Amino acid sequence: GNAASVKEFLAKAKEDFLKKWETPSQNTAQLDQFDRIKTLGTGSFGRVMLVKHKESGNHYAMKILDKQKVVKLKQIEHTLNEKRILQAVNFPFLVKLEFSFKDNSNLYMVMEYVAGGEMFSHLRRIGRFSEPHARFYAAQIVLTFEYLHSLDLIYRDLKPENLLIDQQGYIQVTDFGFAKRVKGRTWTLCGTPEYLAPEIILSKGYNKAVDWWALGVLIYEMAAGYPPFFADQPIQIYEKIVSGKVRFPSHFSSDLKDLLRNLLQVDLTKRFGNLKNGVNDIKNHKWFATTDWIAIYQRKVEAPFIPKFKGPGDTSNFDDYEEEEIRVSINEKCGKEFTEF
């Protein structure tokens, strides 16, 4: 995301968003304009590869989606949401979508390359983040959700795997696959097991409150080293989540435990972020007392950790993945389904 009252700021931000949202960019590049280098990561739906833009010499992260696979996994409308929303947003902590296009077989989304690696790998290696360290990343997510929700957007897949550390040690939110612009309630079952709010698991209509619940899980996992609800199988995780019972590590400060009880709140009439006071219930909470929200947004705060970059094109901060040949059919596939992409 591009680097840099509130009610006024969000007013102008919304104006900018609606313009792109109403008239999305389309077909702004083609496959042969890039040199495919290496796979940076994969999810249930796509493969993201580090690519080299021939003309500019710039390095990018290209997300590749097989149209037939998208259809099989019932992600047609989600994928259209993903591209349409990502090409319209603009925030310091949101990954920037540089180009997008398609061919007979796949869909392509070329984003800025965030070389710091997944928060996930750094978190697992180090074990856990100290409260001040976790707070840093947390604040950025809080501000990012304030921005997204103000645009009537629900994110729906917050997790360390979908969060990247940039060269300045700041967070970049990627993967807008489940992002959706919705005013009222929505019902699709999606997200990641460990991060699902109770209302999603119980097939109830839900709203942006699930994102605040997800934030609770993220903060807990960052500070504890493990999630608040874990098991060997998703079903077992779901049982723990709905029961709501949460136990905190003995090293968790009083302020952190109080905030978490308010975020990992099964009762929607009490879950922070969803109350009458909106996001301020979180931003004014004690655990964030030392947080200077404007400084964070302006990226004037010193990052707790700055990733090592042995130069451009360096992928040492990412695990290695099995590579697969990107074949393109001679026959167009699912043309009608993705006509607006």
Binding site: G177, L189, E194, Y226, R247
Partner: peptide, 20 residues
């Protein structure tokens, strides 16, 4: 310890997103 239980569990690696 809880950490020991987590580390020994089957979901300590990257977690895939779920859907219908």
């Amino acid at each position: 310890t809880t950490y020991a239980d987590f580390i020994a569990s089957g979901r300590t690696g990257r977690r895939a997103s779920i859907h219908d």
